[PDB]
């Protein structure tokens, strides 16, 4: 059986808190803030992605080139095997060739 | 796991609901009924 006999507890959904009330603010700092800053440096996140898009390969090559020297040996070893398996995969495997 | 079907219980029960009158292990188990329910239809 996968279903549950008794119901789960009713999760209270606070639609008015600090985050959701102030959500979406300061996204147009460039449009009507005399372009002193860009909305891309606003987001909090890793250093290998701050206002930039990439696939599995693109994000990995950007990672090892930027922060790979600081990464662990095991994580760096798995990263090299990942791009090597994905390099050949996108290049040789699939349709459209 | 992030996305899992929760109503698997019901979509098979409607199949077995039509196949209750079958004889043997068909009405009890699922895959036995799937072979016979479409054939009976």
């Amino acid at each position: 059986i996968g279903i549950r006999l008794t119901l789960p507890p009713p999760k209270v959904v606070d639609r008015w808190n600090e985050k959701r009330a102030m959500f979406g603010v300061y996204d147009n700092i460039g449009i009507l803030g005399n372009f002193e800053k860009h909305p891309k440096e606003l987001i909090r996140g890793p250093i290998w992605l701050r206002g930039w898009k990439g696939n599995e390969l693109q994000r990995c090559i950007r990672k090892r080139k930027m922060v790979g020297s600081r990464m662990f040996a095991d994580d760096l070893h798995n990263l090299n095997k990942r791009i090597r398996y994905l390099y050949k995969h996108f290049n040789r495997h699939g349709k459209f060739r | 796991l992030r996305n899992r079907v929760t109503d698997r219980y019901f979509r098979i029960q409607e199949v077995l609901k039509h196949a209750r009158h079958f004889r043997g292990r068909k009405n009890r188990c699922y895959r036995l009924a799937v072979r016979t329910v479409i054939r009976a239809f």
């Binding site: 279903i3 549950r4 789960p8 | 899992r4 929760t6 219980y9």
Partner: peptide, 26 residues
């Protein structure tokens, strides 16, 4: 437990339905 409560809701409707058929009130 797997996430979700919609399936558990309709199951309670199936439980009380069976409880109705088993021991219906007068």
């Amino acid at each position: 437990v797997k996430k979700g409560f919609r399936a558990a809701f309709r199951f309670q409707k199936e439980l009380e339905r069976q409880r109705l058929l088993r021991c219906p009130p007068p």
